[PDB]
Design a binder for this molecule. Structure first.
Ligand SMILES: *[C@@H]1O[C@H](CO)[C@@H](O)[C@H](O)[C@H]1NC(C)=O
Ligand SMILES: *[C@@H]1O[C@H](CO)[C@@H](O)[C@H](O)[C@H]1NC(C)=O
Ligand SMILES: *[C@@H]1O[C@H](CO)[C@@H](O)[C@H](O)[C@H]1NC(C)=O
Lengths: 444, 444, 444
């Protein structure tokens, strides 16, 4: 609840603390059915515009069904099989003879129903749309006569309204080769999603968590097209199960740390690597290197462990002692002293080099801080913007406390002559070993 | 048809074989026309709601036309000119005086027609929508009187249905600066695409191939907005021509290969580079380094040669002898021993290091394999999942045969003291030359 | 207006000149309101289809309002706070008691109106849709009786037309966690955008610039959901302010430059780094490293300075003398001699190595140029395509003048034995210092 931050002047890095986890560790698959009409062409002597409008909407229904049939013949390998493997196993079961008859029997009287498939998966099925009932009762008497009977204009509008969701679902499944994410309101309405969450074999706090973050749940869910067979359209919705909840999470921010000599070509740089989200998980730390894999709402991070690395908990000691022997703190080295800034959760890191004009301003007071050459930091308390060169960044105005941990920039502990300056994935001990090797080649 | 796999224990890499190619090497451009109405405002004494609804839909038609006019004045350079250059050459021809009169004459009696343009391109043109006929015959008598005549509600609904495709096409062309990909059903319906494929100057197996993979064809096609001029809206659809068909294709998978000493800081790593899709092509190999450039359907890969590299066929010998003098097998080196796994076509590579808990399970039996430190592999036969640290991966359940090629991990052939450990783009011979240089600097 | 190009044979790089800048340096926020109906359920004895259709569309209105309410309770941190910080500051003001009453008073008589908020921001507000007027006057008398009165079918269609924009706006704000970019025509119609631009506190040439590039303006704008409160739906549109206009801009193109010895393993390579867009800006140069951050229309580049680096103007001297002491020209080194090509603004760079078949053709004449081993270039005058290996590239047919600046490839000035060949981010002086160090270790 209380967000705090710590800037480390020695390593030009900051850690944003106080975040709570929700890591996806499991999947809950659910079958969504649409009752279809196995209509055949019913051309009759037709002229008045209402029959034409009905026949037009009926052809749009007919093309949607044939499009789903060619879509289910070809199932592309191009999805990420490791993240849809559950639902794909259910679709392979659905292709069995008699399984669609089973779901067809369970949704015979109600819209929602639990169905035990023939593979040990107790899935929750839904009937979200009933087009066979509408077409066979309200439309077929209209095109199964000698001359077509005249339907009312209310029927034309209601049929375009009901048929619309089938057409949009066929559009999403067609452009995405049967696998869509996020899951749209066409695939599952917010009302249907909340009812599906409420009916899940999870704790009540987990139902409240997923119900209060339905948009994040949609962004971390998949919709997989199964089969169109025997007047039934079935597709699987894969919802995330957050097996890791309320564990401490923190975000590491890094920026280049160079020396600030006045003669160009004589400066060396180092930047901590592995910036991103860290969360405590089962005696280890789950690290998320890609920036788009974790959604934050309030102080809660919602990550997928599929794109994480598992690190020893000693990885946090790079934040307290980068020179600590329990974990080899990783860095990259260079000579690229271009000024830059990183907007953190509660402030801004500024790496100012060369002649760059770096400053921090308040909207009404003007410049309140001028950065000197090196790596520095400013909290969001009293600061609105940070300007670096010709770029203006805005500071996050979120409430919290920042702590400036003063310390000597560690780049000053290195003799420039023997520094390894172009290391793209090194470590503190890796650099020290390359330096020990250059001192033995130079002593003789 | 038969998918096979080979895991190389010596290099921590796997090759998935048996795939057939379809590489895009050409473009087939086609002109899609929409007959428009050069209507002018026709405000008359109007009150009843049906005239207002018609006038509202007519203004939505009017804004769509002016939006396309400002869209064709500004053609952004931001597209990738090298992949739309064909259609852009056709749009430059269409801007000539009299060329729209030519297509206007060919689609005078039929919907589809071949047109020889004034630049030597024999394009296939289509009339997919006729709004000038509908507006000038059914709507203008309704707003060209002293007082507007009253149109029936069927006319209001039919006009919103016909005008809809124009409005959606204007939306896609507006948000994408005139160049859209993939090509939506609004740009070209599946029925129109299949008819366009069938009418193409290609072999019958190529028409069957593109017709059975229409969604992949859409994802590898472009729609370019040409011109709105003289009651004609024209835009080019660029369809892929697969000049390379049924050549062997294979997918290389790589994972870090480190030594497993018990003292941290004493281990060295190496990873094969250039993982991805390889296809035999014209006496050479077409390599696709980016992961999203090749769509797989069944055992067929559909790539665009635009994002390929051409390599000598000897590049396959990195799979049989990484130490082979005909091709310099490329690697990258490091000391980053973080555990990870790679899901292949028929199994999983696991690089287990440190204290990470790596295992392979069956859904009902539990843990059936525990990986030791190093790089190892498991087939999908009897394995459902692979757990590495806090992450659970699912194995692809596709049928095929895997071959575990046992061999000494080549990282064990290197003396750690003189190994080059931070090489970001090296080669087997590059590393040996850096080692020969470190042994001459150490012998003295 | 006149686009020119310069190919540097010595460094295998080209510079496309003559482009004019438009850099985003500020934001103009604007409030978009939708007058809503605080209706409550009004179930009455209803049977005929017109009441059902109205009640159905009313439930779609009701769900859209509750979806926006749960959307405004949860505001995700996941947006990029530094680029939405303006609008977020306005939304925080809008959440104050009485501020929605202020905008509700200013849009009491007109659609557009300037409103001075209680935070010093003089925002331009708009009333783009009026659903409270339509529902309370045309719909409530239809469900506030003993038995529902019968509405005409025109009312059903007009209500689905008016309610549609609310439903689409709720869809975009829901899938994107309240922050959408680009800004759709649903968020702001082209007519409303042009009227908002015209009413902006900017010069007349800036109104003409943004009005002639509305699609680029949309792609560089943000729509942020604020609050739904007291029969008012408010959201902020953030439009770009281009503080840098008509400054010279140029695009740097680079390609690998290797030696062409006949014995593999004896060749060294070097590639200039920092390819992309450069624009003169306030006595410095704004560099844009990512490829998708700058949209080009004609000869004008539209960039966001948010994703730029500020460089000394001496960075242009890498184009005139890469060996020039005022700026340390950056390079990367390797031994990866794979053939490739780069399509420039007026031609094509070709790096041909090994046995690769590189050629340049005219559509009707055939092969007009065969590249030898090394880095070379061809203008678009007389050339249509460039083939490298199995890949065919199309040359941009834009009019301009190219200049081939002959010069010795600088890779030939380096002794291969002491060259640093795996540098991932080096510089000309960095390489010379590593060479000076290898010559001192070899002289003894
Ligand atoms: C470098 O030498 C020092 C001095 O003995 C030693 O303490 C340190 O551990 C060495 N570093 C490496 C990486 O071997
Ligand atoms: C390294 O030296 C050995 C021994 O003569 C030789 O066989 C090998 O080719 C050399 N490697 C390189 C890259 O020069
Ligand atoms: C390398 O040595 C030469 C010869 O004195 C000198 O001119 C040059 O500046 C040196 N380069 C570096 C990077 O120190």
């Amino acid at each position: 609840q209380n967000i705090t931050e710590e800037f480390y002047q020695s390593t030009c890095s900051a850690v944003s603390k106080g975040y709570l986890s929700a890591l996806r560790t499991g999947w809950y698959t659910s079958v969504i059915t649409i009752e279809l009409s196995n209509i055949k062409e019913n051309k009759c002597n037709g002229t008045d515009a209402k029959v034409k409008l009905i026949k037009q909407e009926l052809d749009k229904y007919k093309n949607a069904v044939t499009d789903l049939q060619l879509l289910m013949q070809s199932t592309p390998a191009t999805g990420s099989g490791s993240a849809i493997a559950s639902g794909v196993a259910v679709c392979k079961v659905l292709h069995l003879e008699g399984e669609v008859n089973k779901i067809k029997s369970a949704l015979l009287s109600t819209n929602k129903a639990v169905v035990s498939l023939s593979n040990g998966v107790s899935v929750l099925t839904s009937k979200v749309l009933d087009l066979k009932n509408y077409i066979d009762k309200q439309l077929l008497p209209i095109v199964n006569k000698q001359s077509c009977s005249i339907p009312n204009i209310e029927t034309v509008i209601e049929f375009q309204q009901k048929n619309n969701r089938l057409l949009e679902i066929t559009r999403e499944f067609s452009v995405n080769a049967g696998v869509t994410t996020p899951v749209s309101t066409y695939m599952l309405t917010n009302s249907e999603l909340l009812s599906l969450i409420n009916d899940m074999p999870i704790t009540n706090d987990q139902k409240k968590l997923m119900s209060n973050n339905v948009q994040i749940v949609r962004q971390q869910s998949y919709s997989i097209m199964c089969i169109i067979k025997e007047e039934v359209l079935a597709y699987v919705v894969q919802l995330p199960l957050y097996g890791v909840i309320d564990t401490p999470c923190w975000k590491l921010h890094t920026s280049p740390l160079c020396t600030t000599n006045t003669k160009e070509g004589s400066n060396i740089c180092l930047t901590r690597t592995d910036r991103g989200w860290y969360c405590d998980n089962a005696g280890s730390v789950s690290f998320f290197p890609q920036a788009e894999t974790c959604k934050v709402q309030s102080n809660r991070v919602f990550c997928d462990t599929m794109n994480s690395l598992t690190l020893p908990s000693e990885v946090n000691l790079c934040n307290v002692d980068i020179f600590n022997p329990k974990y080899d703190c990783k860095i990259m080295t260079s000579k690229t002293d271009v000024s830059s800034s990183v907007i953190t959760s509660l402030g801004a890191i500024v790496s100012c080099y060369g002649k760059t004009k770096c400053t921090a301003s308040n909207k009404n007071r003007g410049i309140i801080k001028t950065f000197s050459n090196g790596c520095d930091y400013v909290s969001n308390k009293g600061v609105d913007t940070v300007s670096v060169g010709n770029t203006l960044y805005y500071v996050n105005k979120q409430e919290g406390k920042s702590l400036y941990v003063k310390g000597e920039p560690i780049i000053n502990f290195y003799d420039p002559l023997v520094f390894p300056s172009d290391e793209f994935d090194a470590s503190i001990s890796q650099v020290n070993e390359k330096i020990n090797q250059s001192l033995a080649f130079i002593r003789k």
